[PDB]
């Protein structure tokens, strides 16, 4: 016995075209090439993908977001390729200055292109969201993936839109740059009196660390019981096998309690979702309600 971390022997057959259910097959692509490389860790098969109206819209406004940032970066580079690569991570598409408040009348070079880029980002994400919902629905599945996606969206919405609006100016939003958004994050914590003292930030961290704890625990557990088909989780839920029993007892004997094959997935979705759920609340409250987390902490 080896560790079941990379496969030993890859096996390949006809491409699976997928379940049909109520999927509109007009919108499904053909199968892509198989990948021996991806094959050593997961499935080799690439495709089909589904591309409907919402996915095309999503891809289109996402490419437009990308190119709005792109055209700005080349303009910062003076149209020079070597300044483009040199400073790629230092380029920043910044929001309108505080004096334009919530106005859409900022000049194209002092915030207007940030507004335009944002419009495009907003359409791209919400279309992709309806898409995670619609792909589940077409398959007759639960809407858990769309629901979990909204928790990530909530944080991004707070950072870019809800908090800046409540604060009075787009200038509060996060710039589009690699290094510049890092600087925004550090500045954010500094002006709000140290975000370590934001209790929703400490909860977001407990859940971020707890996500790595839980996926290490669970990833390792399922591989430990793969010798019993433990990764076939759905049939272990429908009909508990010795994999699910040995996994549960490992934890029960280690820490005193345990999950089930289905319920470990409820711990998991909640552990992860709470990261950006508490995170969004802590950012939302910053400067609208609490100016100084450290001071707020000592007092109320």
């Amino acid at each position: 016995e080896y560790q079941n971390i990379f496969s030993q022997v890859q096996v390949r057959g006809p491409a699976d075209l997928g379940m049909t259910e109520d999927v509109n097959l007009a919108n499904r692509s053909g199968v892509g090439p198989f990948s021996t490389l991806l094959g050593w860790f997961g499935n080799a098969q690439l495709g089909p993908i589904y591309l409907g109206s919402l996915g095309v819209l999503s891809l289109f406004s996402g490419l437009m977001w990308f190119f709005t940032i792109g055209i700005w970066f080349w303009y910062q580079a003076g149209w020079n390729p070597a300044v483009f690569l040199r400073d790629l991570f230092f380029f920043s598409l910044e929001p309108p200055a505080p004096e334009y408040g919530l106005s859409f009348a900022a000049p194209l070079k002092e915030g207007g292109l940030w507004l335009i880029a944002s419009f495009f980002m907003f359409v791209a994400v919400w279309s992709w969201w309806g898409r995670t919902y619609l792909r589940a629905q077409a398959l007759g599945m639960g809407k858990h993936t769309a629901w979990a996606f909204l928790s990530a969206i909530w944080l991004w919405m707070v950072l870019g839109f809800i908090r800046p609006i409540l604060m009075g100016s787009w200038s509060e939003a996060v710039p589009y740059g690699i290094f510049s958004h890092l600087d925004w994050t550090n500045n954010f914590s500094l002006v709000h009196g140290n975000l370590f003292y934001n209790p929703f930030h400490g909860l977001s961290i407990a859940f971020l660390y707890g996500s790595a704890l839980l996926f290490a625990m669970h990833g390792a557990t399922i591989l430990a019981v793969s010798r019993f088909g433990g990764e076939r989780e759905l049939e272990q839920i429908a009909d508990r096998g010795t994999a699910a029993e040995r996994a549960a007892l490992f934890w029960r004997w280690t820490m005193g309690f345990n999950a089930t094959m289905e319920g470990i997935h409820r711990w998991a979705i909640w552990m992860a979702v709470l990261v950006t759920l508490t995170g969004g609340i802590g950012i939302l409250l910053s400067g609208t309600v609490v100016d100084n987390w450290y001071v707020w902490g000592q007092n109320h």
């Binding site: 030993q8 096996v11 929703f200 009909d239 309690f257 409820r266 711990w267």
Partner: protein, 235 residues
């Protein structure tokens, strides 16, 4: 203060969420039992969850959990102490009897079906297209045990079709019958497949399947349990 109200509310919700999550995680295995199989006085601070039903596909019925539970198999162990907390020792051959790390669960004696209702696990010989596409092909290699002798030769791979993965090697024995060996219990090498869990002479006791081209959920557990069990019981 609104931040103060929010953190206090969030903590109330999290207590709620944890309690909900613990009860969901009690749908199998509870109520707790004493070592004689009677229910335990103490069941912890969380109530048993109200039953939920799954409708199984392909006419396979429904499962309701929690519900009256039973090993419907006899368990060949005896208690080791009057008081609780001590090991129960195998009364028989723990590998033939399916106890300890040789344990198997009485799963349905029906094969797992894919989305279309076809057996999910089939030998390459019964599954068009399938083939070793990378790494050392095991087929026709000698199967060797932890005793370093040969138990048989690999005559096939049993493949999870939907996942396109090798689940079992089928190994042919001296008398010309065969057994399934879980893929995760073999080290495929240049010249041999080595099976550290079993000596060559424990391969014949691997439970046998009723059909030469399909494996039931019950047989998979017997087979996997037997093979894992050898790590303790063939050491």
């Amino acid at each position: 203060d609104l931040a103060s109200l929010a953190i206090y509310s969030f903590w109330i919700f999290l207590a709620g969420l944890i309690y909900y999550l613990q009860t969901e995680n009690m749908r199998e295995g509870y109520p707790l039992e004493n070592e004689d199989g009677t229910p335990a006085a103490n069941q912890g601070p969380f109530p048993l969850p109200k039953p939920k039903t799954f409708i199984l596909p392909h006419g396979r019925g429904t499962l309701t959990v929690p519900g009256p539970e039973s090993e419907d198999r006899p368990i060949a162990l005896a208690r080791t102490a009057v008081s609780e907390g001590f090991p129960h020792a195998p009364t028989g051959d723990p590998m033939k009897d399916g106890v300890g790390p040789a344990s198997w669960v009485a799963r349905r004696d029906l094969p797992e079906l894919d989305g279309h209702g076809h057996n999910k696990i089939k030998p390459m010989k019964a599954a068009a297209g399938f083939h070793v596409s990378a790494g050392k092909n095991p087929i026709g290699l000698p199967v060797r045990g932890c005793d370093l002798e040969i138990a048989g030769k690999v005559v096939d791979i049993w493949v999870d079709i939907p996942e396109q993965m090798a689940r079992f090697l089928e190994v042919e024995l001296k008398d010309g019958s065969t057994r399934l060996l879980p893929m995760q219990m073999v080290k495929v090498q240049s010249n041999r497949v080595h099976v550290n869990a079993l000596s060559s002479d424990l391969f014949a006791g691997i439970p046998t399947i009723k059909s030469p081209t399909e494996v039931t959920l019950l047989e998979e557990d017997k087979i996997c349990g037997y093979v894992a069990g050898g790590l303790m019981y063939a050491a």
